[PDB]
Amino acid sequence: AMRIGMVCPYSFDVPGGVQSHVLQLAEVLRDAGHEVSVLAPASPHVKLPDYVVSGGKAVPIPYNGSVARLRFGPATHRKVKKWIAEGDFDVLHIHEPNAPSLSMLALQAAEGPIVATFHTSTTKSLTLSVFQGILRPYHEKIIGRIAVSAVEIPNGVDVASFADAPLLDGYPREGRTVLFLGRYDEPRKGMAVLLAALPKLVARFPDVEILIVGRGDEDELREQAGDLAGHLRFLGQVDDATKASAMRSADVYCAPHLGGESFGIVLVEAMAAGTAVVASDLDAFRRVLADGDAGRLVPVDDADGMAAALIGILEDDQLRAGYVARASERVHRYDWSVVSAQIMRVYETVSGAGIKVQVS
Numbered sequence: 097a098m099r100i101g102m103v104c105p106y107s108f109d110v111p112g113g114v115q116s117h118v119l120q121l122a123e124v125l126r127d128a129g130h131e132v133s134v135l136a137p138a139s140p141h142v143k144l145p146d147y148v149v150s151g152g153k154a155v156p157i158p159y160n161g162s163v164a165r166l167r168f169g170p171a172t173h174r175k176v177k178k179w180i181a182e183g184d185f186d187v188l189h190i191h192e193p194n195a196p197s198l199s200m201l202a203l204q205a206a207e208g209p210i211v212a213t214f215h216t217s218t219t220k221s222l223t224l225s226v227f228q229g230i231l232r233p234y235h236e237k238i239i240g241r242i243a244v245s246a247v248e249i250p251n252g253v254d255v256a257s258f259a260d261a262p263l264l265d266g267y268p269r270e271g272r273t274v275l276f277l278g279r280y281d282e283p284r285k286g287m288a289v290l291l292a293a294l295p296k297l298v299a300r301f302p303d304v305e306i307l308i309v310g311r312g313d314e315d316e317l318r319e320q321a322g323d324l325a326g327h328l329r330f331l332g333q334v335d336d337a338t339k340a341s342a343m344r345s346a347d348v349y350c351a352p353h354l355g356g357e358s359f360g361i362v363l364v365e366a367m368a369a370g371t372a373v374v375a376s377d378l379d380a381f382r383r384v385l386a387d388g389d390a391g392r393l394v395p396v397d398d399a400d401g402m403a404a405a406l407i408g409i410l411e412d413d414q415l416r417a418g419y420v421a422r423a424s425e426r427v428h429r430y431d432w433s434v435v436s437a438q439i440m441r442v443y444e445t446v447s448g449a450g451i452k453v454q455v456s
């Protein structure tokens with residue numbers, strides 16, 4: 097039984113891959129009998145387990161010449177030190193130690209058995225001394241290093257949570273349903289590509305629904321869709337259980353991203369749910385879908401290609417069933433059962449009898 101301290105650099109107020117990774121990992125560890133405490137920025141808009149501690153709020157920097165938009169004040173520095181001093185941790189696991197970040201503040205404040213996970217291409221570069229710049233002395237305090245895609249370990253999901261989620265009332269729809277999940281106002285999420293494919297999709301599937309999960313300006317999007325707006329259904333930013341149900345209820349999950357640096361955990365969620373994936377040919381997505389074995393890859397920012405792919409998947413039951421089968425086999429390697437074991441081996445490696453994380 098270990099005492100583990102974890103640091104998330106991002107508020108839980110907004111959904112994100114790093115945020116969900118840290119909370120779920122904490123839950124998995126506690127279920128195995130370990131003690132976990134999570135430090136993260138102020139998250140007053142969501143309900144959180146009692147083991148989450150607020151590191152305070154990053155406030156805007158009020159002057160020109162900064163190298164960041166937001167900064168944690170002196171209260172945060174004090175909170176971080178107190179949290180470490182009182183935590184008596186066997187391991188400190190920090191996520192995304194970008195500078196400046198709450199994770200880097202924790203790294204500066206602490207020493208002892210420290211592990212870091214690098215979630216993106218940008219933070220993976222920090223495994224190299226040349227990219228650590230004048231923060232080298234702090235990066236040198238990291239004892240174990242995990243790259244999501246040092247040791248490589250993929251981010252985890254609870255497969256059963258998706259596989260066995262209840263269907264939403266009224267689903268599956270005879271008219272078919274394409275699911276989009278994300279903050280659709282952000283251009284990088286590629287809602288614009290799916291909207292440009294919509295006329296061809298509706299011509300072939302006259303009763304099709306685009307089911308949309310995530311926060312954004314629904315009225316602007318409807319206006320963009322013009323006289324096809326009636327094919328759009330918005331759930332808003334729903335809880336995790338509803339999201340899982342939505343995934344299972346859709347006939348296809350569409351991931352039309354124009355770019356990004358993440359692992360692509362939403363594709364894994366769809367695979368777990370038993371829902372066929374059509375995705376942009378991004379490196380991260382190609383890996384999850386085993387180079388097209390476990391889902392359909394479409395060239396990036398290609399609306400005609402995206403329509404063909406979505407129409408193709410909905411029209412060919414054999415093909416769709418094949419992707420789902422290969423995906424359901426594949427996705428077990430991302431389950432927390434398997435993934436958390438790999439992470440614990442790193443914890444074991446960096447820790448040792450009578451050694452604790454302490455304040456620097």
Ligand SMILES: Nc1nc2c(ncn2[C@@H]2O[C@H](COP(=O)(O)OP(=O)(O)O)[C@@H](O)[C@H]2O)c(=O)[nH]1
Nearest residue numbers: 111112113116309310333334335336339358362
């Ligand atoms: N419950 C819920 N989860 C969401 C919502 N939007 C995103 N997520 C989850 O947040 C994570 C997003 O991962 P990712 O695609 O990498 O988002 P990113 O971090 O912004 O790149 C996944 O677990 C999503 O299922 C939402 O509206 N509701």
